[model samples]
Target: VAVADESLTAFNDLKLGKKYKFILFGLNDAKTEIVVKETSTDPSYDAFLEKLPENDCLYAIYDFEYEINGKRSKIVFFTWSPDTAPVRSKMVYASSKDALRRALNGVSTDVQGTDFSEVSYDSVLEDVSRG
Candidate 1:
C-alpha cells in the first residue's frame, strides 16, 4: 500500500512545523493507500481520540501538551488497531507501518494499542512523563 506524499508532508508539519495538535491517518476505502484523514489545532485530546473508528485501523501523531514540573510537550506516534478490526486491516497496517516509518523517522514515542485503555490519556501521560 502506498503512503501518499501529501500525508508525509503533513507528518512533517506536525513533527517540525508544530502547527498541528494532531493528525489522523487512514486507509482509502479501497484499502489501497494511506492518506491524511484529519488534522486540527484544537487542544482537546478527547477530540483527537474521537476521530478514530471503533473497528478500524489508523495511524496518528499528537503534540501532547501537559503541565508537570513545568509545561512539557512530547510528540506521540500511534497505531490504533482495535480488536474488532479485520485481520486483513491489521496485517496491512503492521506492514505499512514500516513504509511510513522509513519515509519519516525520529519520533520520540510510539504507541500501538489493541484496546482503548492502552491508549488512554493518563496512560500516555505517564508513558511520556517517564521519558
Candidate 2:
C-alpha cells in the first residue's frame, strides 16, 4: 500500500486500475492499517463487515476518479484502517464535504485569512466526532 496525495488529481492518478473489493475513507487523512477483501463472497464475513463498529475499520467497493497523464483514470481506492484510530495530529477537523471543497479552492479555511497562511493538505482542521 502507498500514501495517497491529498490532491484530487493525485487521487485520480491512483484510481486508474483494476477493481478492488473494498474502499476506505480512513475517517481522516492519517495513514491507518486496514484490510480489504477482493471478494465479499463469504456470506458470514459479509454480515460482519457490514456491521463494523465505530472506530473499527470498514471497507466497501466504490467508483472513484484517478487523474493520469492529463486524463482521468478509473480505479478503486482500496483502503485499510489501522486497528486503532488515528492520533489527534493525524486527524483532520472538517466535514468530508468541506474538505473536498477546500481542496478545490486551494486554500485551507484555517489559514486562508490569517497570519498562518500556508497552503497544505494537512491544513484540514479536525472536528470532534459526534458519533
Q: lDDT winner among the candidates?
A: 1
Per-residue lDDT for 38-91 in model 1, tens only?
A: 999999888977887888898988889788867978888899999899998898
What tens-digit string does per-residue lDDT give for candidate 2 at 29-109?
Answer: 343322222332232423423433334433333332233445432222212233353444223322232333333322212
Clashes of 1: 0
- The C-alpha local distance difference test score for the whole of candidate 1 amounts to 0.84
Model 1 TM-score, all chains together: 0.90
What would the TM-scores of all predictions be? 0.90, 0.25
lDDT of 2 at 25: 37
